[PDB]
């Protein structure tokens, strides 16, 4: 299953790939992020090749596009977090166990956003001893989505009459969705790491 | 999708009832009456749900790899009240929807023994003084110890902050319970459904 354009990671489970500017894949992440964050300048842009964590969120991904047949399930979108955080998400992905509570809660779970302008706050994006900022940029499965509440610690059902049958996702603003909440372990991809700085 | 589970017409999620005096339902209900033989079984379900099976396997291959052998996976018991029961049909295990002591950690508890999880403050009475106990395949793996406000397992070396157990325990020589902190690490394979 692990995408062929990936580095051959020697039957090992996990590496951290370093792009070279230049690369369409590493400029289409500068442009995603400059887009917002044009004051920051990018360190570096590192491919995260993590085996076990591709095919757990594959296989949800899957099944969310058989659940909803035809919809964009999947979004590109941001998450700021501290130095101590970055070895604990590249090996096992982002934890709502271990999730802040953002200023405008939508619910009790693991946040993303659309602009890394967001993302890139000292309360998310923590500076580390060095200055050293650390954003992911994150497949996530959206799919099916409404304006969370605080209290959500899983999305709430699309009809209260089947409590079980649920969203997918929440978002601060259906129209304009600027953040997204997701509840549930292998829901989201941490794709790439940028390091960056003022 | 295991051979003992029954056509499901094209369909991803299914309950079936067991027939009592054959042999599957023979073997779930030897398991429960070794430690609840006072107890009354109204019926055994099987939960035929292929989604929480596929992420379930997956993750069982993950751990027979990471661990490099086959031994990660226990039968255990989950007590549950009756408003939870459609949502672990469908959903399986959520550590996030929490009742009852967390004394080894904020996961999700499962007993070695049927008797535990048939206390009243797990498999809390409905009206007509029913009872509801999943079955459930848990990926215990390699476990330590537990304590109160774990969020994951801990680190096997601090060394290797996160190279982690698969589970902790209450008593490593003797244990009684696992709490798991991973959606997908627990498959709810048959409900019982008993009285006192
Ligand atoms: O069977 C159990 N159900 C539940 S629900 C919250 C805790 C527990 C629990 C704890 C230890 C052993 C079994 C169970």
Known sequence: ???????????????????????????????????????????????????????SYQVKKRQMDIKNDHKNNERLLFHGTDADSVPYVNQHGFNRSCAGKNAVSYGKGTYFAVDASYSAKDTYSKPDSNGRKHMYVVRVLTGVFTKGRAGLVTPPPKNPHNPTDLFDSV????????????????????????????
């Not at 790939?17 to 044009?38: A, H, W």
């Not at 978002?171 to 960056?196: G, H, M």
Request: aromatic share 16%; charged share 20%; proline share 5%.
């Open 1 to 55: 299953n692990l995408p062929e354009h990936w580095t051959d990671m020697n039957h090992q489970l996990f590496c951290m790939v370093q792009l070279e500017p230049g690369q369409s894949e590493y400029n289409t992440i500068k442009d995603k992020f400059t887009r917002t964050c044009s004051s920051y300048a990018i360190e570096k842009i590192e491919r995260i090749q993590n085996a076990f964590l591709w095919q």
């Open 171 to 198: 978002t601060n603003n259906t129209r304009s969705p600027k953040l997204f909440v997701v509840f549930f372990d292998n829901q989201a991809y941490p794709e790439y790491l940028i390091t960056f700085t003022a």
